[PDB]
Amino acid sequence: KTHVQLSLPVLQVRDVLVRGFGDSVEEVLSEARQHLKDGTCGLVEVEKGVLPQLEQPYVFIKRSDAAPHGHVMVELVAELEGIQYGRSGETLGVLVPHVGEIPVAYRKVLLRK
After folding, report:
1. Could you tell me which residues belong to the region Disordered?
2. How many other C-beta atoms are found inside a 10 Å radius of the C-beta of residue 94?
3. From the candidate CATH numbers 1.10.10, 2.30.30, 3.40.50, 2.20.28, the one assigned to the domain spanning 3-112
4. 3-class SS of residue 85
């Protein structure tokens, strides 16, 4: 399918144990997509002071359109040293590996895959 319904655990930034997906824009988009397929991806909501506590390159989920079955349609955009790779809508959050951190909420998304 071109889209997959996922329910992403929303993590507090200070709980996150693995603070990024890797070392290059291509690697972090690859690993983010793998962890989204495997159910091992968390979401951190972006506010003042969050991104400097995480590792670049960043992977964002961004709104791709204006929400089937309560799932916002999203796509992936990476960022490194102030340059973005992809073009999309409003940020819903930054993706990180999930390794058993307790979430505060879930974010229902329809991921363009």
Report:
1. 1-113
2. 24
3. 2.30.30
4. strand
The answer to whether 8 and 104 have CB atoms below 8 angstroms apart is no
What does each C-alpha distance from 102 to 20, 39, 86, 99 come to in angstroms? 17, 14, 30, 9
Model resolution, angstroms = 1.5
Which approach determined this entry?
X-ray
User: From CA 25, how far away is CA 77, in angstroms rounded?
Assistant: 9
Neighbouring-strand partners of residue 78: 59, 85
User: Are 22 and 28 spatial neighbours (Cβ–Cβ below 8 Å)?
Assistant: yes
The residues, ordered by sequence, that sit 6+ positions from 2 with a Cβ below 8 Å of its Cβ are 112, 113
Domain residue limits, the chain: 3-112
Residue type, position 45, single letter: E
Q: Do 107 and 6 form a contact (C-beta atoms < 8 A)?
A: no
d(CA 90, CA 75): 10
The DSSP code for 14 is: G
3-state secondary structure of 46: coil
